[PDB]
Amino acid sequence: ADLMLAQEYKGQDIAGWAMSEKLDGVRAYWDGKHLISRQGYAFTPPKGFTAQFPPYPLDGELYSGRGQFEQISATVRSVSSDWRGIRLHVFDVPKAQGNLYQRLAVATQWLKTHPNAPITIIPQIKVRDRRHAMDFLKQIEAQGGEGVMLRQPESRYSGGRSSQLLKLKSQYDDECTVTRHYEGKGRNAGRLGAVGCKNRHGEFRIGSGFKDKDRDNPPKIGTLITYRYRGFTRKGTPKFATFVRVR
DNA sequence: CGATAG
DNA sequence: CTATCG
Ligand SMILES: *P(=O)(O)OC[C@H]1O[C@@H](n2cnc3c(N)ncnc32)[C@H](O)[C@@H]1O
């Protein structure tokens, strides 16, 4: 119903937090009877897939292995497919009592007595400091992983955006709406130095990633563009914002 | 003054 | 080498 949503990591201290690998699957909320997607609609898996799920809710990601998102998404969006290989990788037991580790223990005992259920408890590792998190992320991207998830253990499960569940990657990518053009200095005078962009993060400039043709023929105001970035600024806006392509 | 993309 | 942002 009310799905706990993750923010992006900005620089908060995470000493004592619980980190895990960020899985590139499909979000699924188990309400004790149905698998509910982020859009609020129920999935339609084969009968017997959820037959050995617990009668209480579970929040997790429908996942199989690395680099398989397209295969997963295609499999779950159908009503004539095989879900073998797809499991619900659980990252919290929404309605249980205690800290994160005590809530997950509830689902762990269910797996003990239901070993053929297609469920997996996501390992949660204790975080020392920011350097440790970057280290864990560093080796995850090496194995082909996508990033790291950081969770405040003592926190509870709440719906909506939360500062206790943060995404951590080395290179993010998003989209924004071009709002304004800014003339460049020196050898970019009379043409584009940076564009103004707008999205859920507010307004900010993008000055890098532009060819010379892009600077002579910049993207129209109101156009949706894509851009990479790593980390955020003290103002709370994308850092190292690099233009990629249009649309 | 430093790091990045062109 | 030259520009953007950090
Ligand atoms: P990315 O921008 O793809 O967003 C990640 C979303 O997936 C959920 N998720 C995947 N894997 C995990 C783990 N291990 N822990 C917590 N959450 C996870 C996030 O909740 C985001 O919805």
Residue numbers in the entry: 1 to 247
Q: Mind quoting what the paper says about this structure?
A:
The most intriguing structural aspect of Lig E however, is the N-terminal leader sequence which is predicted to direct its localisation to the periplasm.
The resulting structure shows Ngo-Lig E in an open conformation bound to the DNA via interactions with its OB domain only. Key interactions with the DNA primarily involve basic residues from the OB domain and linker including Lys 239, Arg 205, Lys 185, Arg 215, Lys 211 and Arg 187. These residues contact the backbone phosphates of the ‘complement’ strand which is base-paired opposite the nicked strand in other ligase-DNA structures.
